[PDB]
Amino acid sequence: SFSGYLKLTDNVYIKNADIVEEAKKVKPTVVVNAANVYLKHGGGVAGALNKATNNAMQVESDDYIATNGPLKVGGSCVLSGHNLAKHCLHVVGPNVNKGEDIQLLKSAYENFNQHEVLLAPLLSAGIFGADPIHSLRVCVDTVRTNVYLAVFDKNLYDKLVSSFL
Numbered sequence: 001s002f003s004g005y006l007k008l009t010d011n012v013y014i015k016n017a018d019i020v021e022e023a024k025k026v027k028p029t030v031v032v033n034a035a036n037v038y039l040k041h042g043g044g045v046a047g048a049l050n051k052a053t054n055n056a057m058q059v060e061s062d063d064y065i066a067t068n069g070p071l072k073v074g075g076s077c078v079l080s081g082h083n084l085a086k087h088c089l090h091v092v093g094p095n096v097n098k099g100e101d102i103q104l105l106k107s108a109y110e111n112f113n114q115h116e117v118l119l120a121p122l123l124s125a126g127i128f129g130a131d132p133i134h135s136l137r138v139c140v141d142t143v144r145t146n147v148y149l150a151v152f153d154k155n156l157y158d159k160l161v162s163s164f165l
């Protein structure tokens with residue numbers, strides 16, 4: 001199971017880890033991807049997860065988009081987890097660098113409540129431009145299921161833990 005996590009609340013855990021390496025190790029039922037509405041996994045967490053699947057995630061995603069159209073900001077879809085997990089929950093947090101509504105971050109985290117346990121990154125953090133301290137706060141105040149957060153950056157992980165209220 002998940003090891004080396006710091007417990008933040010009854011259901012939220014956090015670790016300084018590369019979510020790709022964490023997924024390859026744990027092979028959780030659900031790994032969350034920091035997706036965009038087009039499921040174009042170019043960079044950040046999405047680029048890294050997709051590269052770990054040898055682009056199989058992108059091939060599956062393009063078929064999903066061809067059939068269903070784009071996701072909504074704040075929405076999600078469940079696809080295969082490939083070699084990383086049973087499933088990948090592609091969740092679209094608002095991208096403040098694209099001028100999207102930060103208020104949709106709570107709606108994005110609500111998708112996690114449909115899964116009893118998840119390995120996840122902080123939504124809208126990194127290249128999505130939101131404040132990761134705010135993302136962690138929204139996560140702990142929204143998600144009720146068991147979420148294991150992987151924070152790639154050690155300095156950000158330390159800042160998140162040391163400032164956690």
Ligand SMILES: N[C@@H]1CCCc2c(O)cccc21
Nearest residue numbers: 001002026027028029030117
């Ligand atoms: N590797 C096991 C397979 C069974 C499901 C599961 C999970 O939900 C979370 C963490 C690890 C695992």
